[PDB]
Design a protein around this ligand. Sequence first.
Ligand code: CA
Length: 83
Amino acid sequence: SMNIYVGNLNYRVREEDLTGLLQQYGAVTSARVITDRETGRSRGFGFVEMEDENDARRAIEELFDQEFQGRKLIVKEALERPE
Ligand SMILES: [Ca+2]
């Protein structure tokens, strides 16, 4: 497994958009956009879990520094952490 941090996101980026992006490289088991507790609105970052570490590292290597919906991605291995 690998937990992937995705950040500097267009605030319109949804969980399904993150899954859509990362599932191109391998199986995705979880996708979460972190939101403001009161407004419920995206804070511009989230986490995607992929079942295969090798596919996750591949996704990070390909996606590094690419723009997504008008903003340069932050895409990096995250600390494995429960929700
Ligand atoms: Ca690990």
